[PDB]
């Protein structure tokens, strides 16, 4: 469905992956690729999954909202040297295309009333096979930790890519943490602890650390559609 | 107290750590510095932990075991270049002395059956101050987790270092549950997962994951002492 065009070598400053349709003509995996690939009455409901980190990488990849199409480039530190995370991130991750956890809209109490991180709503896919650095993926949402990044709101919804074997056999937060022991753990505490080394700070989570339902979760990522959709 | 001689250079292969009394004279951490500090007799039970890899950071330092007064130095590939974890580790992470998890002797049903994993039993120290390498600490056991690495048994034991500010309120996994949210699943998943990039594996806990209490874990340091002790016995 969308075609990389990657440019560079992975670990050095001039790689950079864009996105263009198949026809040619270029697009922004967050501006124009569409939330829902086969609309919202879609059951199971399908959500486009932008790859910005793959499963067992360092680097920070990720959108360059900035720049003209939104191309995905390693994010520098401001020694200018290129930045990554103090461990490895064991999931593909990425963003939701057409998604933003607006600043201005304060969460209740379940999480700290932190704020919006400002960013694209952020999606970990947990399946078995790595996907590559600006792929793109329709994905089932199975749940979503509520980490309190420094006074931010910084959910990390959980998702399931389609094609993956266990996709149907994974629906909720249950299942996951019956089918795939370590996931939902790992992933909460791999945020947890990942700036301890770099900021000497342990992170928080929400709701008494719980990841919500499912259907919760999707309801988060609605919230975050309309805010972007209000954005323009 | 013991003097760490430190030799070469940070991260590079001729990076070593050696130690000695202070009369000057050099011993081996595994061998000659005792398990118990103040005896096995002292309350509260204390063990040395010989700290390898310091809260914060990733190469794969260890105690070379063939070399004399078995320094700790980087862990190298086979490539010959210096192996480093995939991720950080998050806590002061060593080994005891005069321990040695003999394989060949068979673990019950709640670890698999697995084996021995050959090494100087492993330890966790969840304290807040980072550590030296090559330092050696008096902790007090908290509890043990019983990870499975391919068929080995490799424990990882839970301690708290002497001196550390809630040293005298912890005294099992409950304490830390209570007192340090995340410690105990933060150190399950590390271990569980740090191998995936490098390996493709998912390690397994026996004891359906828990983290065994401190009397187990007391006991399982116990276990290994007695093994690596067989080994320089006589008749
Ligand atoms: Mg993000
Ligand atoms: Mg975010
Ligand atoms: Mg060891
Ligand atoms: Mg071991």
């Not at 969308?2 to 440019?7: D, T």
């Not at 995905?72 to 963003?95: C, F, H, P, V």
Request: proline content about 7%.
């Amino acid at each position: 469905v969308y075609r990389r065009l990657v440019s560079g070598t992975e670990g050095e400053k001039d790689f950079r992956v864009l996105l263009s349709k198949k026809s040619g003509e270029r697009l922004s995996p967050w501006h124009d690729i569409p939330l829902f690939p086969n609309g919202r009455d879609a059951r199971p409901l399908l959500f486009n999954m932008v790859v910005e980190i793959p499963k067992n990488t360092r680097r920070k990849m990720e959108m360059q909202l900035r720049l003209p199409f939104t191309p995905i480039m390693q994010d520098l530190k401001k020694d200018g040297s290129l930045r990554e995370y103090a461990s490895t991130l064991y999931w593909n991750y990425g963003a939701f295309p057409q998604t933003w956890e607006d600043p201005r809209e304060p969460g209740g109490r379940e999480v700290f009333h932190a704020r919006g991180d400002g960013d694209p709503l952020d999606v970990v896919e947990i399946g078995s096979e790595v996907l590559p650095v600006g792929g793109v993926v329709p994905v089932k949402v199975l749940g979503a930790l509520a980490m309190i990044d420094g006074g931010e709101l910084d959910w990390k919804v959980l998702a399931i890519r389609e094609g993956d074997p266990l996709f149907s056999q994974l629906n909720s937060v249950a299942d996951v943490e019956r089918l795939c022991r370590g996931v939902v753990p790992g992933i909460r505490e791999w945020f947890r602890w990942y700036k301890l080394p770099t900021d000497n700070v342990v992170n928080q989570f929400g709701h008494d650390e719980a990841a919500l339902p499912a259907a919760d979760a999707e309801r988060v990522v609605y919230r975050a559609h309309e805010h972007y959709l209000r954005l323009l």
